[PDB]
Inverse folding.
């Protein structure tokens, strides 16, 4: 999950 969001940065 964290990676899924982290792609934004
Ligand atoms: C949430 O975005 C997210 C993305 C990816 C993963 C994840 C966990 C484990 C592996 C892996 O190769 O583990 C080997 C034991 C890859 N990706 N978790 C959460
Ligand atoms: N918000 N995230 C980003 O902007 C971002 C963009 C690119 C990358 C990235 C990481 C690893 C490799 C590689 N070839 O290992 C290439 N690109 N990581 C993060
Ligand atoms: C809830 C969730 C789990 C894993 C990824 C890659 C994305 C979202
Ligand atoms: C964990 C996280 C992901 C994305 C933003 C924009 C901020 C924090």
């Amino acid at each position: 999950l964290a990676a899924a969001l982290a792609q934004a940065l």
Observations:
- Helices lie at 2-6.
- Residues 2-6 form the longest helix (5 residues).
